[PDB]
Amino acid sequence: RKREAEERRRFPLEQRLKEHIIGQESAIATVGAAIRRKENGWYDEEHPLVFLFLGSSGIGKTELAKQTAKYMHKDAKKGFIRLDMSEFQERHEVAKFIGSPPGYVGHEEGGQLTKKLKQCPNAVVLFDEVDKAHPDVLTIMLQLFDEGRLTDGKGKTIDCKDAIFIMTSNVASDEIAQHALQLRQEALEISKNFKENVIRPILKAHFRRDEFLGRINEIVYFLPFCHSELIQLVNKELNFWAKRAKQRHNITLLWDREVADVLVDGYNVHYGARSIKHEVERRVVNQLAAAYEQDLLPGGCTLRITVEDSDKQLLKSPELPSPQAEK
Amino acid sequence: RKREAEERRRFPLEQRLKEHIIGQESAIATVGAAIRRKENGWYDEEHPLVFLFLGSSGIGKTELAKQTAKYMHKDAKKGFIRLDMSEFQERHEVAKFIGSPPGYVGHEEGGQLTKKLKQCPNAVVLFDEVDKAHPDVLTIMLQLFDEGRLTDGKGKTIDCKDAIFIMTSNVASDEIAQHALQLRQEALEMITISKNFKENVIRPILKAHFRRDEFLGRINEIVYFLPFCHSELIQLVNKELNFWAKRAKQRHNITLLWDREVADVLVDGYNVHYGARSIKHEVERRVVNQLAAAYEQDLLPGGCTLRITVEDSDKQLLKSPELPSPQAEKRLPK
Amino acid sequence: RKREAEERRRFPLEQRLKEHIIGQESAIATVGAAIRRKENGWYDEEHPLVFLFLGSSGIGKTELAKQTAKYMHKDAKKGFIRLDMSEFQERHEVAKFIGSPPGYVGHEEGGQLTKKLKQCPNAVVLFDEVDKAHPDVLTIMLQLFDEGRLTDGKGKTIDCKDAIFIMTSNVASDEIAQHALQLRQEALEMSITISKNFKENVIRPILKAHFRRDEFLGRINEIVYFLPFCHSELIQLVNKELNFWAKRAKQRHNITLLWDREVADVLVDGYNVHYGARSIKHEVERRVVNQLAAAYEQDLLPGGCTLRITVEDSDKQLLKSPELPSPQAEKR
Amino acid sequence: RKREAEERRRFPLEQRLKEHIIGQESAIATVGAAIRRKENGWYDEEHPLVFLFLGSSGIGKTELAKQTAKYMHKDAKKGFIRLDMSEFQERHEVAKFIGSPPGYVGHEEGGQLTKKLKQCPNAVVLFDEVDKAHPDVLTIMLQLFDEGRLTDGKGKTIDCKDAIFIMTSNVASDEIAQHALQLRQEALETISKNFKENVIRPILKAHFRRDEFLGRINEIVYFLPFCHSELIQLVNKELNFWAKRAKQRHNITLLWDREVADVLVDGYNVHYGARSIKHEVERRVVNQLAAAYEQDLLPGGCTLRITVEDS
Amino acid sequence: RKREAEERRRFPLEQRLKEHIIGQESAIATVGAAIRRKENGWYDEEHPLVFLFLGSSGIGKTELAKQTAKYMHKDAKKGFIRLDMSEFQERHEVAKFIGSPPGYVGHEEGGQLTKKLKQCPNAVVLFDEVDKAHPDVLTIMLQLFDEGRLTDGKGKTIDCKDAIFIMTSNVASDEIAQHALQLRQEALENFKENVIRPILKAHFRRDEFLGRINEIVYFLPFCHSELIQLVNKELNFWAKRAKQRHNITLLWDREVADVLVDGYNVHYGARSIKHEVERRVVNQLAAAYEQDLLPGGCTLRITV
Amino acid sequence: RKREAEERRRFPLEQRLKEHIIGQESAIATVGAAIRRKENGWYDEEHPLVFLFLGSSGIGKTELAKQTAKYMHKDAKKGFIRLDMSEFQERHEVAKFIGSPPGYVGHEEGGQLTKKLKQCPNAVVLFDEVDKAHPDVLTIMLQLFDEGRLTDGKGKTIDCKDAIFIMTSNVASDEIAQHALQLRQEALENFKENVIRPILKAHFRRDEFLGRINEIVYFLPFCHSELIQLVNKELNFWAKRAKQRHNITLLWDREVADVLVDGYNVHYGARSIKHEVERRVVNQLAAAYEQDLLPGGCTLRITV
Ligand SMILES: Nc1ncnc2c1ncn2[C@@H]1O[C@H](COP(=O)(O)OP(=O)(O)OP(O)(O)=S)[C@@H](O)[C@H]1O
Ligand SMILES: Nc1ncnc2c1ncn2[C@@H]1O[C@H](COP(=O)(O)OP(=O)(O)OP(O)(O)=S)[C@@H](O)[C@H]1O
Ligand SMILES: Nc1ncnc2c1ncn2[C@@H]1O[C@H](COP(=O)(O)OP(=O)(O)OP(O)(O)=S)[C@@H](O)[C@H]1O
Ligand SMILES: Nc1ncnc2c1ncn2[C@@H]1O[C@H](COP(=O)(O)OP(=O)(O)O)[C@@H](O)[C@H]1O
Ligand SMILES: [Mg+2]
Ligand SMILES: [Mg+2]
Ligand SMILES: [Mg+2]
Ligand SMILES: [Mg+2]
Secondary structure (H helix, E strand, O other), X not given: OHHHHHHHHHOOHHHHHHOOOOOOHHHHHHHXXXXXXXXXXXXXXXXXXXXXXXXXXXXXXXXXXXXXHHHHOOOOHHHEEEEEHHHOOOHHHHHHHHOXXXXXXXXXXXXXXXXXXXXOOXXXXXXXXXXXXXXXXXXXXXXXXXXXXXXXXXXXXXXXXXOEEEEEEOOOHXXXXXXXXXXXXXXXXXXXXXXXXXXXXXXXHHOOOHHHHOOOOEEEEEOOOOXXXXXXXXXXXXXXXXXXXXXXXXXXXXXXXXXXXXXXXXXXXXXOHHHHHXXXXXXHHHHHHHHHHHOOOOOOOEEEEEEOOOEEEEOOOOEOOOOOOOO | OHHHHHHHHOOOHHHHHHHHOOOOHHHHHHHHHHHHHHHOOOXXXXXXXXXXXXXXXXXXXXXXXXXXXXXXXXOOHHHEEEEEHHHOOOHHHHHHHHOOOOOOOOOOOOOHHHHHHHHOOOOEEEEEXXXXXXXXXXXXXXXXXXXXXXXXXXXXXXXXXXXEEEEEOOOOHHHHHHHHHHHHHHHOOOOXXXXXXXXXXXXXXXXXXXXOHHHHHOOOEEEEXXXXXXXXXXXXXXXXHHHHHXXXXXXXXXXXXXXXXXXXXXXXXXXXXXXXXXXXXXXHHHHHHHHHXXXXXXXXXOEEEEEEOOOOOOOXXXXXXXXXXXXXXXXXXX | OHXXXXXXXXXXXXXXHHHHOOOOHHHHHHHHHHHHHHHHOOOOOOXXXXXXXXXXXXXXXXXXXXXXXXXXXXXXXXXXXXXXXXXXXXXXXXXXXXXXXXXXXXXXXXXXXXXXXXXXXXXXXXXXXXXHOOHHHHHHHHXXXXXXXXXXXXXXXXXXXXXXXXXXXXXXXXXXXXXXXXXXXXXHHHOOOOOOHHHHHHHHHHHHHHHOXXXXXXXXXXXXXXXXXXXXXXXXXXXXXXXXXXHHHHHXXXXXXXXXXXXXXXXXXXXXXXXXXXXXHHHHHHHHHHHHHHHHOOOOOOEEEEEEEXXXXXXXXXXXXXXXXXXXXXXX | OHHHHHHHHHOOHHHHHHHHOOOOHHHHHHHHHHHHHXXXXXXXXXXXXXXXXXXXXXXXXXHHHHHHHHHHOOOOOOOEEEEEHHHHOOHHHHHHHHOOOOOOOOOOOOXXXXXXXXXXXXXXXXXXXXXXXXXXXXXXXXXXXXXXXXXXXXXOEEEOOOOEEEEEEOOOHHHHHHHHHHHHOOOOOOOOOOHHHHHOHHHHHHHOOOHHHHHOOOEEEEOOOOOHHHHXXXXXXXXXXXXXXXXXXXXXXXXXXXXXXXXXXXXXXXXXXXXXXXXXXXXXHXXXXXXXXXXXXXXXXXXXXXXOOOO | OHHHHHHHHOXXXXXXXXXXXXXXXXXXXXXXXXHHHHHOOOOXXXXXXXXXXXXXXXXXXXXXXXXXXXXXXXXXXXXXXXXXXXXXXXXXXXXXXXXXXXXXXXXXXOOHHHHHHOOOOOOEEEXXXXXXXXXXXXXXXXXXXXXXXXXXXXXXXXXXXXXXXEEEEOOOXXXXXXXOOOOOOOOOOOOOOOOHHHHHHOOOOHHHHHHHOOEEEEOOOOOHHHHHHHHHHHHHHHHHOOOOHHHOXXXXXXXXXXXXXXXXXXXXXXXXXXXXXXXXXHHHHHHHHHOOOOOOOOOOOOOO | OXXXXXXXXXXXXXXXXXXXXXXXXXXXXXXXXXXXXXXXXXXXXXOOEEEEEEOOOOOOHHHHHHHHHHXXXXXXXXXEEEEOHHHOOXXXXXXXXXXXXXXXXXXXXXOOOHHHHOOXXXXXXXXXXXXXXXXXXXXXXXXXXXXXXXXXXXXOEEXXXXXXXXXXXXXXXXXXXXXXXXXXXXXXXXXXXXXXXXXXHHHHOOOOOOOOOOEEEEOXXXXXXXXHHHHHHHHHHHHHHOOXXXXXXXXXXXXXXXXXXXXXXOOOOOHHHHHHHHHHHHHHHHHHHHOOOOOOOEOOOOOO
């Protein structure tokens, strides 16, 4: 008890997530508060904890879910359960949850989800892209979210009252991103309850049933990044590549402050972080790989990126001559 | 003779339910009357007793069913049979009730519901969220509700005549809620009764969109759950706070107190579409989160008090065992 | 010979049925005539006798079938083979009739129907709610009717030529009910209900669409139509229910129960055409029986308890005295 | 490591593609750069590499995909997985990818795409003419393109993080051609910046209705219409193919001059591109060779000059 | 090698076509030229041959396809496959063409086209009345023609590079019949029929549909000479098959065969003329035989 | 030789059928003539033999098919094969018509048709309503023509050039009944194909399904003489069917038949007359027997 409490206080989940997620402070704060509430025993054991993650594309929803799963279960693969709801676009596909009835092909195998949950009753379940499921498939989750009960095709009931369920979608993402015009309001010169009652009609229009929505403990809103968070993302990506280069080939990598400013221009609000990822890859790592194959990067050398309308690489001082693949 | 004398004394079922349920007086009365009738004889043994529970979400339908099962069979697990009809969305899934026919996988296993009913013939059967089932699956329930007889894949009848069947659904949720709101508005001029509204409005819904006539004909009683009144919302908030205070005292020896304004602020977060679940989540979010954060060495076994800040109806804080001191900032960004 | 002499005399099937069934006189007459024709041999003895029962819900189809089975076989349970077709909604369900083939799971049990038939060749077989059966099941049924014998999964063939097959459904229930109500209204314009063969021809396409086997319908010996109850038949139903409850009370607790025509009218006012006798049964249970059960634990004692109507609700009178018992108000 | 790196330096992928692909320099450069970045280990292993080929019909998109697959998996047919999204033009066609759920016909079989991917995790997957898919069929591709993960009807999860996905379509063909005119709109007194992709995005979003789908695509490769020189090169390629075929089959030598290439190009059709050129050559020249051969006017070993044989 | 040499050296296809087909000389020549060109190389083997047969119905189109399938697969009936696109007019009928997805109705069947092709990839496929094909079926056929590659619903892929696809329709039958640029004008056995191209364009995705077609074959209405040849061939078939052998040499003179042609039924095609001949040529023979009236045979002489 | 002589003596088959059938002389004569022609080599014996029978239900179609099978086949109608195409649908076509082949859901190879054709290739095969037949089964039935060789669930194919197929329908039932000229004007006191395939071509795609049918047989509404003859035969059966036949007198049997025919068969066929007889006779006799009013020498009773 004492060691767990001391470790949690010393290195909170919220500080652990911040290492991997940039921004999203209100989502981090909500998930951390719920998690901490559960861990300290201040939770009802009858009803499992359920989250729904909403916002635009590529802003860390599945990332946050993965980090939460890793934190809850340090490494156990069975502790984290993935479900790509995009494979459940038809009603009949719900059989994958619980398996076929008696007398039907595949009956001897129980429900896949039932088996997975049985292997780890307190696992973290991620229904990714839940809006891509057929809405009759979501009906199977009514008892799962209310009481953590699920009966396979063989009549065996699974108890998962202590599990944590996370759903992710971008259902209201235009309306959430449009409400980030509150960042543009500049009053000196974050989502309101009444906005959540404008985001509701959209949720019921998609997720047809009020008894489904009334089962979720928390709706988490992920906002579009502000300019500083874009700079942080670019720096994070460059640091990742620098670490990889240093580890693999002992190459030291440096970049001026203006490199991030140049790179952020590739940001696409419709795609989020992955846009920055692709931009950095395309217009830095391509040059890096071309130089490496050309053998212009001796082990232990120092490479610094300089800023033009394009990006140049200096081998500790001289400009590295760009190789010619076409010869 | 003493069992008979107790039964003469055994009239708390309404009390037992009202302990766990707030409001829904009409439903409690109906269920209690039917159960008393069955208990004291005065009931035909040739036909099971069937209820259908209708209303909005999070208003005690499943809760009432579970409480009734517990009362009838005490803690006996075999006495309460649960089925989540959301798993029966396909016609072929009816095989779960009776098992596979001879010469097919799982035939030797036999029906599951048939086995459970054999274990406890007088069990309380709950088909939760029945309107999620494929109508062809409901078709099998005709015989079960009429004569309480079901034949498994092996040809064995179970003869569950004296069981009790409870069905929970929200098919007419929007109509019932709107009608109840209108009736309450009318009563506000100067309470929970609907005479023909059921036949003219509810019945065509139930029949046309989901069922056959013969299926509805076998239901002994239709029970209607209405949305909570404001006082009932206050009662629900008080119930949740009492539950959390009981947990705190029992486990951490912490005494928890609050005020009426706390109840008002909490109920302000109530959402009609979700019923008691909205209040439950609100209480967990705005109070229990602060209690769990204070439990990092700032809570000790004393009279912790919950109060509203100077910002009326905006914020609420914990105060220490000694009321003159508010609890600190919980200091997360160490 | 003694059994034959006793059966036909002093106890015709119609006489017995009228004891349990209210109305449906035409159906009772048809069933009795067909049964007598079969018994005396003035019928196609080369084929089993087949019936189809149609009409709204709660009008005695299953009840009439059960009473007929009891009359044919007295108390012999083996003489009444009951099959609820709602379990045969899938193609492979036919295996239950004959069991699995040799070498398969459960083949040693060659189907329930075959075993029961060989146990009682002349048993009355009821396929309740036949319309729910899968078309392959209906094909097997038609094969059984035409052939007159069935072969189990073990290769044994069982002769059931003398068996009686009864089927119940509600395929044309709405058409039958609305036509019967229209004929009652038309007869009130004369101031009754005998449905003409042209209405049967109108109904026939519905049956042809549902079953899609013109030979299957043709093979049916008799189609029996049950009508929705008239007001007098509803009053009789209410009186029957009240008599049942009164005799139950008298036997169990020596309580005498009385009522008046007004009570019967009030109870029948709760009738619902879509559910038939079930609606009246439930109304009687909730309106009256609930009060009896509530008052039983403390107030009821041997004597004359009479039901009365104050204005619109049913009230009770004290034993042998015109005092209204105080209801044992639950809770407090 | 050193031998493979030296081999790649000696004979890069670009030359191999140029052996067969004509023009499309920008597309070849982009694909080659991405492939080299992958091979040299300078790529994140958490996400597969995804391409989207856009351009008019008959300009080598699927041809480029085939050449790339051959380069990566030259000695493995299993290394190249081909799909044709015309065969997926309705929502329920997703059941081909992962198979039917438990208790349904074909369940025991399992997904086809899952089988193929499991056989060769690092294969090259080609979704030919993806635009013809029902849009809800593309939804199944989200996990594939993001994490290279897919689950069949039996619950088995296929990991293909190192695979390469190529999607070919002509959704913005007309707009791409109009932009390509920019190079041909020059005052001229070859490479387009193509920042106008900001206004190509709406077309894709209209067709592919989900932004998250586009966000998962690493690169958008644009194939431009052939120029006059590229058309001449294509005609020369076709005539070389036919000449070598004649030599190998009937031992006949076949020869021509500029007048033939120009006359064949003059019959070019934009709507078909390389296919137009193929049809033109076949109709105008191959028919004459076949007729002459059937008349036995071509003794074995003889030499033909196409001395501008026209009209 | 000797088998291949004999296959090459055997009778030219046009010989058999002329043997069994009457008229349609232009179509015979075109098909023979295309097949010979393919055999002698001079044709990219990477793409299957695609033929579009135009003209009135019932004038040998299917017969010509059968004979072609006979040339290449004389020893195998499976070498010829038929599909009538009157079966394939609505979106859900795409699943009948190449099979349903797994877990759906008819998945086991696997579709008509693939089910037959997998047995004989190099067969001859006849799509009757492609006009009636639903656009989504037209999309799968054009894909198949372009690539020669198709997947069934069960995931099995089929290579049909060397197959021969023949499409038949009557979209421009009236224009060909009325123009008759060869029949009654040049030969009754280039015309620059430039209206057929726009006519077809109006009915399909001309970019792909007409671009991929390897060849277009025209069928012309029968002429008087062709009709009398067909009647002579029918009467000879009846005469030689006379199993009551001794009545053979029931010779049909000339003018009665001309009167049988005068029962013009070309609207229904050749089989119509067959019925015409059978009516007043076979019924009288059956009546006489049943009556035992005519042992030893007789001239058909004149009747009507 | 004795079997051959017996088969020869079976003719005239028209008398054979009339021994057990009433009316339908035209159809009987047509069938007999077709049989003779095929036997005598005056038919396209290379092609399957197929009739389509048209008219209302219950007018001797099944009765003529069964009598034809009983006579042609030696005895017991072993070579008869009749099926209800109304139960054949997309979910049942292959599983029953071809019969669920190995590897399919179900192992009922043959299913309903080809499981019996394994023994009697020349079967008389009855399809009881093409109006209710599924398009898939109507297409697979196209194999039955040309050469037959319909695929079985076991893979076996039967050459149908010798088989007899009897499709039937009620969709054309009006074409005969509405006129009654084919009955009134057929040498009693209209024309063959008065209208060529009026409804049938539009409904069953004459191009394939009906184009391959060799003959069409009309069925006419029963005449008053035919109806009264049916009544008389049924009454004779009941009279002899009596166990205590001494009580059977049949006094006024002709008058009772006249009363019975009042409920004329104009609804679904002779079964209407059978029900008339059962209602107006059998019930009365059963009631009298129950009342012990039948000692012997008992007359009839004229009701109405
Ligand atoms: N703070 C961040 N926000 C978003 N992405 C981040 C962040 N930090 C790192 N990333 C990375 O950027 C990528 C974003 O992709 P996702 O995690 O899947 O976001 P998403 O919310 O699920 O978008 P969709 O709904 O799948 S389109 C991930 O690969 C992350 O690892
Ligand atoms: N004609 C009747 N006379 C007396 N009691 C009847 C009569 N009909 C029904 N009952 C009673 O009310 C109950 C109704 O059940 P059934 O008669 O079997 O239903 P049904 O008439 O067949 O219509 P379905 O099958 O529900 S659509 C019976 O169990 C009887 O006890
Ligand atoms: N750029 C090219 N250089 C040389 N050959 C080419 C080129 N493009 C196409 N071809 C050839 O022309 C044919 C066209 O094939 P594709 O490459 O597949 O066309 P496509 O662009 O991919 O587009 P679709 O599917 O008609 S939209 C192939 O036969 C190629 O071999
Ligand atoms: N020499 C011939 N020319 C044309 N048709 C012929 C010849 N011999 C037979 N036929 C008949 O022509 C038909 C061939 O197919 P056909 O009907 O003409 O094509 P389609 O129906 O598609 O228009 C067959 O019915 C065949 O009997
Ligand atoms: Mg995601
Ligand atoms: Mg509930
Ligand atoms: Mg019943
Ligand atoms: Mg292509």
